[PDB]
Coordinates of C-alpha atoms in Angstrom, one line a residue:
Chain X
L1 CA 0.0 0.0 0.0
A2 CA 3.1 2.2 -0.5
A3 CA 3.2 5.4 -2.5
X4 CA 5.8 4.4 -5.4
Chain G
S1 CA -1.7 -13.3 -38.4
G2 CA -0.9 -13.8 -34.6
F3 CA -2.4 -11.9 -31.7
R4 CA -0.4 -10.0 -29.1
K5 CA -0.9 -7.6 -26.1
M6 CA 0.4 -4.6 -28.0
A7 CA 1.4 -1.1 -26.7
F8 CA 1.4 2.1 -28.6
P9 CA 4.8 3.3 -29.8
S10 CA 6.2 5.3 -26.8
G11 CA 8.5 8.0 -28.4
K12 CA 6.0 10.8 -28.2
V13 CA 5.6 10.2 -24.5
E14 CA 9.3 9.6 -23.9
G15 CA 10.2 13.1 -25.0
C16 CA 7.9 14.5 -22.2
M17 CA 9.4 12.6 -19.2
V18 CA 11.5 14.5 -16.6
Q19 CA 12.7 14.0 -13.0
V20 CA 11.2 16.0 -10.1
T21 CA 12.9 16.2 -6.7
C22 CA 11.6 17.9 -3.6
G23 CA 13.9 17.6 -0.6
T24 CA 14.9 13.8 -0.6
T25 CA 12.0 12.4 -2.6
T26 CA 12.6 11.9 -6.4
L27 CA 10.0 10.9 -9.0
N28 CA 9.0 11.3 -12.6
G29 CA 7.0 14.2 -14.0
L30 CA 5.3 14.9 -17.3
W31 CA 6.5 17.9 -19.2
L32 CA 4.1 19.5 -21.7
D33 CA 4.5 23.0 -22.9
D34 CA 5.6 25.1 -19.9
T35 CA 4.1 22.8 -17.3
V36 CA 5.4 19.7 -15.5
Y37 CA 2.8 17.4 -13.9
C38 CA 3.7 15.0 -11.0
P39 CA 2.2 13.3 -7.9
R40 CA 1.7 15.8 -5.0
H41 CA 3.3 13.3 -2.6
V42 CA 6.7 14.4 -4.0
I43 CA 6.4 17.0 -1.2
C44 CA 6.0 14.2 1.4
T45 CA 8.5 12.2 3.5
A46 CA 7.8 8.7 4.7
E47 CA 6.3 9.9 8.1
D48 CA 4.0 12.4 6.4
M49 CA 2.5 9.7 4.2
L50 CA 0.8 8.2 7.3
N51 CA -1.4 11.3 7.7
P52 CA -0.4 14.1 5.3
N53 CA -2.0 17.5 5.0
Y54 CA -1.0 18.6 1.5
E55 CA -2.4 22.1 1.8
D56 CA -0.2 22.7 4.9
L57 CA 2.9 20.8 3.5
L58 CA 2.7 22.7 0.2
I59 CA 2.4 26.3 1.5
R60 CA 5.8 25.6 3.2
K61 CA 7.4 25.2 -0.3
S62 CA 8.8 27.8 -2.7
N63 CA 9.4 27.5 -6.4
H64 CA 13.1 26.6 -5.8
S65 CA 11.9 23.9 -3.4
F66 CA 11.5 21.9 -6.6
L67 CA 14.2 20.6 -8.9
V68 CA 13.1 19.6 -12.4
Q69 CA 15.7 17.9 -14.7
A70 CA 15.1 17.2 -18.4
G71 CA 18.0 15.0 -19.5
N72 CA 21.1 16.8 -18.1
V73 CA 19.3 20.2 -18.3
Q74 CA 17.9 21.9 -15.2
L75 CA 14.5 23.5 -15.7
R76 CA 13.7 26.4 -13.5
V77 CA 10.3 26.3 -11.7
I78 CA 8.6 29.7 -11.8
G79 CA 5.1 28.8 -10.6
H80 CA 3.3 25.9 -8.8
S81 CA -0.2 25.0 -8.0
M82 CA -2.0 21.9 -6.7
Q83 CA -4.7 20.2 -8.7
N84 CA -6.4 17.5 -6.8
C85 CA -3.7 14.9 -6.2
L86 CA -1.2 16.4 -8.7
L87 CA 1.2 19.3 -8.7
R88 CA 1.5 21.6 -11.7
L89 CA 4.9 23.1 -11.9
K90 CA 5.5 26.1 -14.3
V91 CA 8.9 26.1 -15.9
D92 CA 11.0 28.6 -17.8
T93 CA 11.0 26.5 -21.0
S94 CA 8.2 25.0 -23.1
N95 CA 8.9 21.4 -24.0
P96 CA 9.9 21.5 -27.7
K97 CA 9.0 17.8 -28.0
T98 CA 5.4 18.5 -26.8
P99 CA 3.2 16.3 -28.9
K100 CA -0.4 17.0 -29.8
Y101 CA -2.3 15.8 -26.7
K102 CA -5.5 15.6 -24.7
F103 CA -6.2 14.6 -21.1
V104 CA -8.9 11.9 -21.0
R105 CA -10.5 10.0 -18.1
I106 CA -10.6 6.4 -19.0
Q107 CA -13.5 4.1 -18.1
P108 CA -13.2 0.7 -16.4
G109 CA -12.5 -2.0 -19.0
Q110 CA -10.6 0.2 -21.2
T111 CA -6.9 -0.3 -22.0
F112 CA -3.9 1.9 -22.3
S113 CA -0.1 1.7 -22.6
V114 CA 2.1 2.5 -19.6
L115 CA 5.6 3.9 -20.1
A116 CA 7.4 2.8 -16.9
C117 CA 10.1 5.4 -15.9
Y118 CA 12.6 5.7 -13.1
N119 CA 14.5 9.0 -12.4
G120 CA 12.8 10.6 -15.5
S121 CA 14.3 7.9 -17.8
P122 CA 11.9 5.7 -19.7
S123 CA 12.6 2.0 -19.0
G124 CA 9.8 -0.1 -20.5
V125 CA 6.4 -0.2 -22.1
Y126 CA 3.4 -2.5 -21.6
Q127 CA -0.3 -2.6 -22.0
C128 CA -2.9 -3.1 -19.3
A129 CA -6.6 -2.5 -18.6
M130 CA -8.4 -0.4 -16.1
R131 CA -10.0 -3.1 -13.9
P132 CA -13.7 -2.9 -12.8
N133 CA -12.3 -2.3 -9.3
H134 CA -10.2 0.7 -10.6
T135 CA -6.8 -0.9 -10.3
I136 CA -4.3 -1.8 -12.9
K137 CA -2.1 -5.0 -12.9
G138 CA 1.1 -3.1 -13.7
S139 CA 4.8 -3.8 -13.0
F140 CA 6.2 -0.9 -10.8
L141 CA 9.1 -0.5 -8.5
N142 CA 10.0 2.2 -6.0
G143 CA 10.6 5.4 -8.1
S144 CA 7.9 4.6 -10.8
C145 CA 5.4 7.2 -9.4
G146 CA 4.6 9.8 -12.0
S147 CA 4.9 7.2 -14.8
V148 CA 2.1 7.8 -17.3
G149 CA -0.5 5.8 -19.2
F150 CA -1.8 6.8 -22.6
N151 CA -3.4 5.9 -25.9
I152 CA -2.4 7.3 -29.3
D153 CA -5.0 8.4 -32.0
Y154 CA -3.3 9.6 -35.3
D155 CA -0.6 11.8 -33.8
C156 CA -2.5 12.9 -30.7
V157 CA -1.5 11.4 -27.3
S158 CA -4.4 10.8 -24.9
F159 CA -3.0 10.7 -21.5
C160 CA -5.2 8.9 -19.0
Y161 CA -3.1 7.7 -16.0
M162 CA -0.3 8.9 -13.7
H163 CA 1.1 6.3 -11.2
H164 CA 0.8 6.9 -7.5
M165 CA 0.7 3.7 -5.4
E166 CA 0.7 0.0 -5.0
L167 CA -1.9 -1.8 -2.8
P168 CA -1.1 -4.7 -0.6
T169 CA -2.2 -7.2 -3.3
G170 CA 0.6 -6.1 -5.7
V171 CA -1.8 -4.2 -8.0
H172 CA -1.6 -0.5 -8.7
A173 CA -3.6 2.8 -8.3
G174 CA -3.3 6.3 -9.6
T175 CA -5.0 9.3 -11.2
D176 CA -6.1 10.9 -14.5
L177 CA -4.1 13.9 -15.5
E178 CA -6.4 16.2 -13.5
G179 CA -5.2 14.5 -10.4
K180 CA -8.4 12.7 -9.6
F181 CA -7.9 9.1 -8.6
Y182 CA -9.4 6.1 -10.2
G183 CA -11.5 4.3 -7.5
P184 CA -12.0 5.0 -3.8
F185 CA -8.2 5.4 -3.2
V186 CA -6.2 8.3 -1.6
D187 CA -2.6 9.3 -1.6
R188 CA -1.8 8.5 2.0
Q189 CA -0.5 5.3 3.6
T190 CA -3.6 3.8 5.3
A191 CA -5.4 0.5 5.4
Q192 CA -7.1 0.7 2.0
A193 CA -7.4 -2.3 -0.4
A194 CA -8.6 -3.2 -3.9
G195 CA -12.3 -3.9 -4.0
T196 CA -13.5 -7.3 -5.4
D197 CA -12.8 -7.5 -9.1
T198 CA -14.8 -9.0 -11.9
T199 CA -14.0 -10.2 -15.4
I200 CA -14.6 -7.7 -18.3
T201 CA -17.3 -9.6 -20.3
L202 CA -17.2 -7.1 -23.3
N203 CA -13.4 -7.8 -23.8
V204 CA -13.7 -11.6 -23.5
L205 CA -16.4 -11.4 -26.2
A206 CA -14.2 -9.2 -28.4
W207 CA -11.3 -11.6 -28.0
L208 CA -13.5 -14.5 -29.1
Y209 CA -14.3 -12.5 -32.2
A210 CA -10.5 -11.9 -32.7
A211 CA -10.1 -15.7 -32.6
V212 CA -12.7 -16.1 -35.4
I213 CA -11.2 -13.3 -37.6
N214 CA -7.8 -15.1 -37.3
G215 CA -9.5 -18.3 -38.3
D216 CA -10.7 -20.4 -35.3
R217 CA -14.3 -21.5 -34.8
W218 CA -14.0 -24.5 -32.4
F219 CA -15.8 -22.9 -29.4
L220 CA -18.9 -21.9 -31.4
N221 CA -22.3 -23.8 -30.9
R222 CA -25.7 -24.2 -32.5
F223 CA -27.3 -22.3 -29.6
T224 CA -28.4 -18.7 -28.9
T225 CA -29.2 -16.9 -25.6
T226 CA -31.3 -14.0 -24.3
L227 CA -29.3 -11.2 -22.8
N228 CA -30.9 -12.0 -19.4
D229 CA -30.3 -15.8 -19.4
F230 CA -26.6 -15.1 -20.2
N231 CA -26.3 -12.7 -17.2
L232 CA -27.7 -15.3 -14.8
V233 CA -24.7 -17.5 -15.9
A234 CA -22.3 -14.5 -16.1
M235 CA -23.0 -13.4 -12.5
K236 CA -22.3 -16.9 -11.1
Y237 CA -18.9 -17.0 -12.8
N238 CA -18.0 -13.4 -11.7
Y239 CA -18.3 -11.8 -15.1
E240 CA -19.7 -8.2 -15.4
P241 CA -23.3 -8.2 -16.7
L242 CA -23.6 -7.7 -20.4
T243 CA -25.8 -4.7 -21.4
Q244 CA -27.4 -3.8 -24.7
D245 CA -24.8 -1.0 -25.1
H246 CA -22.0 -3.8 -24.9
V247 CA -24.0 -5.9 -27.4
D248 CA -24.2 -2.7 -29.6
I249 CA -20.3 -2.0 -29.5
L250 CA -19.8 -5.6 -30.7
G251 CA -21.6 -4.7 -34.0
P252 CA -18.7 -4.3 -36.3
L253 CA -17.0 -7.4 -35.1
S254 CA -20.3 -9.3 -35.3
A255 CA -20.7 -8.0 -38.9
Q256 CA -17.1 -9.0 -39.9
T257 CA -17.6 -12.7 -38.8
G258 CA -21.3 -13.2 -39.4
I259 CA -21.8 -14.3 -35.8
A260 CA -24.7 -12.7 -33.9
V261 CA -23.6 -11.2 -30.6
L262 CA -26.0 -13.3 -28.5
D263 CA -24.8 -16.3 -30.5
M264 CA -21.2 -15.5 -29.4
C265 CA -22.7 -15.0 -25.9
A266 CA -24.1 -18.6 -26.0
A267 CA -20.7 -19.7 -27.1
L268 CA -19.1 -17.9 -24.1
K269 CA -21.9 -19.2 -21.8
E270 CA -20.8 -22.8 -22.9
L271 CA -17.1 -22.1 -22.3
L272 CA -17.9 -21.0 -18.8
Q273 CA -20.0 -24.1 -17.9
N274 CA -17.9 -26.7 -19.8
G275 CA -14.4 -25.3 -19.6
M276 CA -11.9 -25.4 -22.5
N277 CA -10.1 -28.6 -21.3
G278 CA -6.8 -29.0 -23.1
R279 CA -7.8 -26.6 -25.8
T280 CA -6.5 -23.1 -26.4
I281 CA -7.9 -19.9 -27.9
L282 CA -5.4 -17.6 -29.7
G283 CA -2.6 -19.4 -27.8
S284 CA -4.4 -19.0 -24.5
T285 CA -5.3 -21.6 -22.0
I286 CA -7.7 -19.1 -20.3
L287 CA -10.4 -16.6 -21.3
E288 CA -8.6 -13.2 -21.9
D289 CA -10.2 -9.9 -20.9
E290 CA -7.5 -7.2 -21.5
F291 CA -8.4 -6.5 -25.2
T292 CA -11.2 -4.0 -25.9
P293 CA -13.3 -4.3 -29.1
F294 CA -11.2 -1.4 -30.3
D295 CA -7.9 -3.2 -29.6
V296 CA -9.2 -6.1 -31.7
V297 CA -10.3 -4.0 -34.7
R298 CA -6.9 -2.1 -34.5
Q299 CA -4.8 -5.2 -34.5
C300 CA -6.7 -7.8 -36.5
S301 CA -7.1 -8.0 -40.3
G302 CA -10.2 -6.3 -41.7
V303 CA -10.6 -9.6 -43.7
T304 CA -11.8 -12.7 -41.9
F305 CA -10.0 -16.1 -42.5
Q306 CA -13.2 -17.9 -43.4
Chain P
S1 CA 5.6 -5.6 -7.6
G2 CA 3.8 -7.2 -10.6
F3 CA 5.3 -8.9 -13.6
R4 CA 4.6 -8.1 -17.2
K5 CA 5.9 -8.8 -20.8
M6 CA 7.6 -5.5 -21.2
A7 CA 9.1 -3.9 -24.4
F8 CA 11.8 -1.4 -24.6
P9 CA 10.7 2.2 -25.2
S10 CA 10.4 2.5 -29.0
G11 CA 11.2 6.2 -29.8
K12 CA 14.9 5.6 -30.7
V13 CA 13.6 3.1 -33.3
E14 CA 10.6 5.1 -34.4
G15 CA 12.8 7.9 -35.7
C16 CA 14.5 5.5 -38.0
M17 CA 11.4 4.1 -39.8
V18 CA 10.8 5.0 -43.5
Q19 CA 8.7 3.7 -46.4
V20 CA 10.3 2.0 -49.4
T21 CA 8.5 1.4 -52.7
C22 CA 9.7 -0.4 -55.8
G23 CA 7.1 -0.5 -58.6
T24 CA 3.9 -1.5 -56.9
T25 CA 5.4 -3.2 -53.7
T26 CA 5.5 -0.9 -50.6
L27 CA 7.1 -1.8 -47.3
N28 CA 9.1 -0.5 -44.3
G29 CA 12.8 0.3 -44.3
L30 CA 15.3 1.2 -41.5
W31 CA 17.1 4.5 -41.9
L32 CA 20.5 4.9 -40.2
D33 CA 23.0 7.5 -41.3
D34 CA 22.9 7.6 -45.1
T35 CA 21.6 4.1 -45.5
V36 CA 18.1 2.5 -45.6
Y37 CA 17.8 -1.2 -45.0
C38 CA 14.9 -3.3 -46.2
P39 CA 13.8 -6.8 -47.5
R40 CA 15.2 -7.5 -51.0
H41 CA 11.8 -8.9 -52.0
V42 CA 10.6 -5.3 -52.3
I43 CA 11.9 -5.7 -55.9
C44 CA 9.5 -8.7 -56.3
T45 CA 5.9 -9.0 -57.6
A46 CA 3.6 -11.9 -56.5
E47 CA 4.6 -14.0 -59.5
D48 CA 8.3 -13.7 -58.9
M49 CA 7.9 -14.7 -55.3
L50 CA 7.2 -18.3 -56.5
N51 CA 10.7 -18.6 -58.0
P52 CA 12.7 -15.3 -57.9
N53 CA 16.2 -14.7 -59.0
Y54 CA 17.3 -11.6 -57.0
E55 CA 20.5 -11.1 -58.7
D56 CA 18.7 -11.0 -62.1
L57 CA 15.7 -8.9 -60.8
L58 CA 18.1 -6.4 -59.1
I59 CA 20.3 -5.7 -62.0
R60 CA 17.2 -4.5 -63.9
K61 CA 16.7 -1.7 -61.3
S62 CA 18.3 1.8 -61.1
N63 CA 18.6 4.1 -58.1
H64 CA 15.4 6.0 -59.1
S65 CA 13.6 2.6 -59.3
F66 CA 13.3 3.0 -55.4
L67 CA 11.3 5.6 -53.7
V68 CA 12.2 6.3 -50.0
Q69 CA 9.8 8.5 -47.9
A70 CA 10.6 9.8 -44.5
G71 CA 7.5 11.4 -43.1
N72 CA 6.4 13.6 -46.0
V73 CA 10.0 14.1 -47.2
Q74 CA 11.3 12.1 -50.3
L75 CA 14.8 10.8 -49.8
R76 CA 16.8 10.4 -53.0
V77 CA 18.5 7.0 -53.5
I78 CA 22.1 7.5 -54.8
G79 CA 23.4 4.0 -54.4
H80 CA 22.2 0.4 -53.8
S81 CA 23.6 -3.0 -53.1
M82 CA 22.3 -6.4 -52.0
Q83 CA 23.4 -7.9 -48.8
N84 CA 22.2 -11.5 -48.4
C85 CA 18.4 -11.0 -48.2
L86 CA 18.5 -7.3 -47.6
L87 CA 18.8 -4.2 -49.8
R88 CA 21.1 -1.4 -48.7
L89 CA 19.9 1.9 -50.2
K90 CA 22.3 4.9 -50.0
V91 CA 20.4 8.2 -49.7
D92 CA 21.3 11.9 -50.1
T93 CA 20.6 12.6 -46.4
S94 CA 21.9 11.1 -43.1
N95 CA 19.2 10.4 -40.6
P96 CA 19.6 13.1 -37.9
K97 CA 17.6 11.0 -35.5
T98 CA 20.1 8.1 -35.9
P99 CA 20.7 6.6 -32.4
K100 CA 23.8 4.9 -31.2
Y101 CA 23.4 1.4 -32.5
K102 CA 24.8 -2.1 -33.2
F103 CA 23.7 -5.0 -35.4
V104 CA 23.6 -8.2 -33.4
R105 CA 22.6 -11.7 -34.2
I106 CA 20.3 -13.0 -31.5
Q107 CA 20.4 -16.6 -30.2
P108 CA 17.4 -18.9 -29.9
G109 CA 15.7 -18.3 -26.5
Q110 CA 16.6 -14.6 -26.4
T111 CA 13.9 -11.9 -26.4
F112 CA 13.6 -8.6 -28.2
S113 CA 11.0 -5.8 -28.8
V114 CA 9.3 -5.5 -32.2
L115 CA 8.0 -2.2 -33.5
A116 CA 5.3 -3.2 -36.0
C117 CA 5.1 -0.7 -38.8
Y118 CA 2.9 -0.2 -41.9
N119 CA 3.8 2.3 -44.6
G120 CA 6.9 3.4 -42.6
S121 CA 4.6 4.6 -39.8
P122 CA 5.1 2.8 -36.4
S123 CA 1.8 1.3 -35.1
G124 CA 2.6 -0.9 -32.1
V125 CA 5.2 -2.5 -29.9
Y126 CA 5.4 -5.9 -28.3
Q127 CA 8.0 -8.4 -26.9
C128 CA 8.7 -11.8 -28.2
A129 CA 11.3 -14.6 -28.1
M130 CA 13.4 -16.2 -30.8
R131 CA 11.9 -19.7 -30.6
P132 CA 14.2 -22.8 -30.7
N133 CA 12.8 -23.4 -34.2
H134 CA 13.9 -20.0 -35.3
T135 CA 10.5 -18.5 -35.6
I136 CA 8.8 -15.7 -33.6
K137 CA 5.1 -15.7 -32.5
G138 CA 4.5 -12.1 -33.7
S139 CA 1.4 -10.2 -34.8
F140 CA 1.9 -9.0 -38.4
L141 CA -0.4 -8.0 -41.3
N142 CA 0.3 -7.4 -45.0
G143 CA 2.8 -4.5 -45.2
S144 CA 4.7 -5.2 -41.9
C145 CA 7.8 -6.5 -43.8
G146 CA 10.9 -4.5 -42.9
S147 CA 9.5 -4.0 -39.3
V148 CA 12.4 -4.4 -36.9
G149 CA 13.3 -6.1 -33.6
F150 CA 15.7 -4.6 -31.1
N151 CA 16.9 -4.5 -27.5
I152 CA 18.2 -1.3 -25.9
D153 CA 21.3 -1.1 -23.6
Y154 CA 21.9 2.3 -22.1
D155 CA 21.3 4.5 -25.1
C156 CA 22.6 1.9 -27.7
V157 CA 19.9 0.2 -29.9
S158 CA 20.9 -3.4 -30.7
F159 CA 18.9 -4.3 -33.9
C160 CA 18.5 -8.0 -34.3
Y161 CA 15.5 -8.8 -36.5
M162 CA 13.8 -7.5 -39.7
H163 CA 10.5 -9.0 -40.7
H164 CA 10.2 -11.0 -44.0
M165 CA 7.5 -13.6 -43.9
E166 CA 4.7 -15.6 -42.2
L167 CA 4.6 -19.3 -42.3
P168 CA 1.4 -21.5 -42.7
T169 CA 1.1 -21.9 -38.9
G170 CA 0.7 -18.2 -38.4
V171 CA 4.2 -17.7 -36.9
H172 CA 6.9 -15.4 -38.3
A173 CA 10.4 -15.6 -40.0
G174 CA 13.0 -13.0 -41.0
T175 CA 16.7 -12.0 -40.8
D176 CA 19.3 -10.2 -38.7
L177 CA 20.4 -6.8 -40.1
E178 CA 23.1 -8.5 -42.3
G179 CA 20.2 -10.0 -44.2
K180 CA 20.9 -13.6 -43.0
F181 CA 17.8 -15.5 -42.0
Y182 CA 17.0 -17.1 -38.7
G183 CA 16.5 -20.8 -39.3
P184 CA 16.4 -22.8 -42.6
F185 CA 13.9 -20.3 -44.3
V186 CA 14.3 -18.5 -47.7
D187 CA 12.6 -15.3 -49.1
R188 CA 10.5 -17.2 -51.7
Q189 CA 7.0 -18.6 -51.7
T190 CA 7.6 -22.4 -51.4
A191 CA 6.5 -25.2 -49.2
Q192 CA 8.6 -24.5 -46.2
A193 CA 7.3 -24.8 -42.6
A194 CA 8.3 -24.3 -39.0
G195 CA 10.3 -27.1 -37.6
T196 CA 9.1 -28.7 -34.3
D197 CA 9.4 -26.4 -31.4
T198 CA 10.5 -27.0 -27.8
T199 CA 10.0 -25.0 -24.5
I200 CA 12.9 -22.8 -23.5
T201 CA 13.9 -24.4 -20.2
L202 CA 16.3 -21.6 -19.1
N203 CA 13.5 -19.0 -19.3
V204 CA 10.9 -21.2 -17.5
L205 CA 13.5 -21.5 -14.7
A206 CA 14.2 -17.7 -14.7
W207 CA 10.5 -17.0 -14.4
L208 CA 10.2 -19.3 -11.5
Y209 CA 13.0 -17.3 -9.8
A210 CA 11.0 -14.1 -10.7
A211 CA 8.0 -15.6 -8.8
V212 CA 10.2 -16.1 -5.7
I213 CA 11.7 -12.6 -5.9
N214 CA 8.2 -11.2 -6.0
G215 CA 7.2 -13.3 -3.0
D216 CA 5.8 -16.8 -4.0
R217 CA 7.3 -20.1 -2.9
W218 CA 4.4 -22.5 -3.3
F219 CA 5.9 -24.7 -6.1
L220 CA 9.2 -25.4 -4.2
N221 CA 9.9 -28.9 -2.7
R222 CA 12.4 -30.7 -0.3
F223 CA 14.0 -32.4 -3.3
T224 CA 17.1 -31.9 -5.5
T225 CA 18.1 -33.4 -8.9
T226 CA 21.1 -34.2 -10.9
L227 CA 21.4 -32.3 -14.2
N228 CA 21.0 -35.6 -16.1
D229 CA 18.0 -37.0 -14.2
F230 CA 16.2 -33.6 -14.9
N231 CA 16.9 -33.9 -18.6
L232 CA 15.4 -37.3 -18.9
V233 CA 12.2 -35.7 -17.5
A234 CA 12.7 -32.5 -19.6
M235 CA 13.0 -34.4 -22.8
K236 CA 9.7 -36.3 -22.3
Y237 CA 7.9 -33.0 -21.7
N238 CA 9.5 -31.4 -24.8
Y239 CA 11.7 -29.0 -22.8
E240 CA 15.2 -28.2 -24.2
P241 CA 17.9 -30.0 -22.3
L242 CA 19.5 -28.0 -19.5
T243 CA 23.3 -27.5 -19.7
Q244 CA 25.8 -26.5 -17.1
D245 CA 26.1 -23.2 -19.0
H246 CA 22.3 -22.5 -18.3
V247 CA 22.8 -23.6 -14.7
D248 CA 25.7 -21.0 -14.6
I249 CA 23.6 -18.1 -16.1
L250 CA 21.0 -18.7 -13.3
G251 CA 23.7 -17.9 -10.7
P252 CA 22.7 -14.3 -9.8
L253 CA 19.0 -15.3 -9.5
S254 CA 20.0 -18.3 -7.5
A255 CA 22.0 -16.0 -5.2
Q256 CA 19.2 -13.5 -4.8
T257 CA 16.7 -16.1 -3.6
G258 CA 18.9 -18.6 -1.8
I259 CA 17.5 -21.5 -4.0
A260 CA 20.1 -23.7 -5.6
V261 CA 19.6 -24.1 -9.4
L262 CA 19.2 -27.9 -9.3
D263 CA 16.8 -27.4 -6.4
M264 CA 14.7 -25.1 -8.6
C265 CA 15.1 -27.8 -11.3
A266 CA 13.6 -30.4 -8.9
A267 CA 10.8 -27.9 -8.3
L268 CA 10.2 -27.6 -12.1
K269 CA 10.5 -31.4 -12.5
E270 CA 7.7 -31.7 -10.0
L271 CA 5.5 -29.0 -11.8
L272 CA 5.9 -31.1 -15.1
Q273 CA 4.9 -34.4 -13.5
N274 CA 2.2 -33.1 -11.1
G275 CA 0.8 -30.1 -13.0
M276 CA -0.2 -26.9 -11.3
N277 CA -4.0 -27.8 -11.0
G278 CA -6.0 -24.6 -10.1
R279 CA -2.9 -22.7 -9.0
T280 CA -1.2 -19.9 -10.7
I281 CA 2.4 -18.6 -10.9
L282 CA 2.8 -14.8 -11.4
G283 CA -0.8 -14.7 -12.5
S284 CA -0.2 -17.5 -15.0
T285 CA -2.0 -20.8 -15.4
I286 CA 0.9 -22.2 -17.4
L287 CA 4.7 -22.3 -17.3
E288 CA 5.9 -19.2 -19.1
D289 CA 9.1 -19.3 -21.3
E290 CA 9.4 -15.9 -23.0
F291 CA 11.4 -14.1 -20.2
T292 CA 15.2 -14.6 -20.2
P293 CA 17.2 -14.5 -16.9
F294 CA 18.2 -11.0 -18.1
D295 CA 14.5 -9.9 -18.6
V296 CA 13.9 -11.0 -15.0
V297 CA 16.9 -9.1 -13.4
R298 CA 15.9 -6.0 -15.4
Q299 CA 12.3 -6.0 -14.4
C300 CA 12.3 -7.5 -10.8
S301 CA 13.4 -5.8 -7.6
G302 CA 17.0 -6.5 -6.6
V303 CA 15.4 -7.1 -3.2
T304 CA 13.5 -10.4 -2.6
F305 CA 10.2 -10.4 -0.7
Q306 CA 11.3 -13.0 1.9
Chain W
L1 CA 3.9 -18.8 -46.0
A2 CA 3.5 -15.3 -47.6
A3 CA 6.2 -12.7 -47.7
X4 CA 4.6 -9.8 -45.6

């Protein structure tokens, strides 16, 4: 669920 | 002959890709005319992602808070505003490689090409579909944020996606080029997850037409179905319901092969109930749903192998 | 995360594509510096294709027998020679968009990106592998001849394929950029057919590593195998035999995951004997063989999801 | 088996  | 997941040629988009750094965060931005678009979370550190206030974080930034690099050339930021989940950075130079373009919001089920970039340098290109649950099954590493999705009509690039995040399932979420997200997702690190997905019926159907245009009829049958009796089957196999509008769109493909849409729907209905077992369609062991009717017309011959 | 068939970005190649017409035949040519490469069968009509003599057909041509068009600009041919199954056309202008390049001959099992073109205008991009039988499973219509395949390292384009023909199975054959064909095929319309194909073992293995790097271990087992006992299984399932050199190449992937090559070979051996049944690997229902070890390193994280 |  990480911002990339 | 043959049938492949095919991307648009990426050069018009490649000449638009830059690098945007704020503080210690670096990602990709899209440079058109005197503007560079990127994810607003470029102004965020790891700890702000948990609960960021972007209005408050942004007002603490100046124009020289942002470094934009196009190749080995530094662009000077001379204006900045927030638009939804994007930043718009004004720069001292118009991109001379700016193509003819549009910003479009794509609908679930539609496909586009992604140009995956790291550090403003394009690294690969692939095709994918907007899923019914508003995610894409992409391939993205740390630093791919601000990578864009697009389609190309004549020489006009229609940009439809900018990359923002990856969900715990390994699938991807982001925004149109107005900074509005696809689906119920937000650019903060919270418990949020893909909703339940469904198979894109229209696409499966189109790709069965593709099979016929290329010369295969094995999965056809002597039956027909009502739109409503198909959907009772569809829904038990987790396909989207088929609508008269989807039946309509399939008109040209129907006309090229001489197979009535509801007759192809009976053919699908039978594939769902009976499986394929050992047999393939267009090389595939499974029913494929990432080609639109448009993708099939574009790629296939206009002349059926009868 | 995610794993996709990914093409190189196509813009360096796009700016090299032209149209070549001789008489009534039109196809694509590749324009580097003051040369344009294309299939020699551009000098052929339908009836000559049955039994052409290219030396005899070519000597009957002048420089102005050939029309080269780059966008809406006519290039003037000022020299021409035949090289194997290619024509080299000298033109009055060097391509100013010429990238750094090399001509390479690709080996069976290796992959490359194809930029499919019609009338010298790029229309799509996809990835494929040189099959053990020297064919590619491409997607090509009438007019795609002279479409090229390539890989990109840093900013150097390595061209490895030019498109010539389609065989009766729907698969494709062509040449390196020296005009030498891949496989036993010839540029005339005769009874010639793909030889029997085999699965690329090295690639399947690599893609099992890819699965592990992305976080899946379900297909692993407590067993190991000798190189020779694996090949007795391989050969009954129509896989290429694995060699110590292939075992070697898998070193970096082996080192990243902590799985010994012959241990992954036992894992494969068991997948062949027992099937997958209901289960998928990297989204796939079947064992995939169109990613090299190199394709996996390039696309995957350097950090395993342990 | 056509030239394309």
